[PDB]
Design a protein around this ligand. Structure first.
Ligand SMILES: O=C(O)c1cccc(C(=O)O)n1
Ligand SMILES: O=C(O)c1cccc(C(=O)O)n1
Ligand SMILES: O=C(O)c1cccc(C(=O)O)n1
Ligand SMILES: [Eu+2]
Ligand SMILES: [Eu+2]
Ligand SMILES: [Eu+2]
Length: 190
């Protein structure tokens, strides 16, 4: 249904929808692993469906439509604890490459494309454990797509070869994220 921000379970899948207070985002849970998001002149938000907790060898499928108009990502998206890490395997994005300004560490080939790997740092920012300083890990897919399958282990293994280690997993979703933009998406996870 159309829901306000929160987390929970819907039709067998964990979901998370967070919105920074700017309005303009309509997040809807659908049947099965489906969710949709339609946004207009948003702030920053993140929404999607998956698992709580994720795993270090899940193969994640996604399909549907993704039509951002500006700064937006479509990603496998999640966290670990001890260490505290927010990670992204970015399958598609809008006008802003999330790695802009970041230092590249390497490349991994998976599911039909090369990805570029990066590490960034969030300082005193919101997190799954409250205000915190933590690293973010990125794999950015060169061949943008809105449906496919992601072998998460390929990314976690490449990241580890760059000294980027993960802790105990927290949630693991396919997320649409927007940052002060407009768009539509309708995505089914499995
Ligand atoms: O009344 C509201 O502000 C409302 C209602 C449904 C969704 C949302 C939202 O996603 O912010 N907000
Ligand atoms: O309950 C709500 O309506 C809500 C909560 C957080 C952010 C937003 C929003 O950005 O409208 N709305
Ligand atoms: O206070 C709110 O959450 C609010 C106010 C205006 C629009 C919206 C919305 O788009 O959710 N939300
Ligand atoms: Eu609202
Ligand atoms: Eu080649
Ligand atoms: Eu908060």
């Amino acid at each position: 249904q159309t829901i306000q921000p929160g987390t929970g379970y819907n039709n067998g899948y964990f979901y998370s929808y967070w919105n920074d207070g700017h309005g303009g985002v309509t997040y809807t849970n659908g049947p099965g692993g489906q969710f949709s998001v339609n946004w207009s002149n948003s702030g920053n938000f993140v929404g999607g469906k998956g698992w709580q907790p994720g795993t270090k060898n899940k193969v994640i499928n996604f399909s549907g439509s993704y039509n951002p108009n500006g700064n937006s990502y479509l990603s496998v998206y999640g966290w670990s604890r001890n260490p505290l890490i927010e990670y992204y395997i970015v399958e598609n994005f809008g006008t802003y490459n999330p790695s802009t300004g970041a230092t590249k560490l390497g490349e991994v080939t998976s599911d039909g494309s090369v990805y570029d790997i990066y590490r960034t740092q969030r300082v005193n920012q919101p997190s799954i454990i409250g205000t915190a300083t933590f690293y973010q890990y990125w794999s950015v897919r060169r061949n943008h797509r809105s449906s496919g399958s992601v072998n998460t282990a390929n990314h976690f293994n490449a990241w580890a070869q760059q000294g980027l280690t993960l802790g105990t997993m927290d949630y693991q979703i396919v997320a649409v994220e927007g940052y002060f933009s407009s768009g539509s998406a309708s995505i089914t996870v499995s």
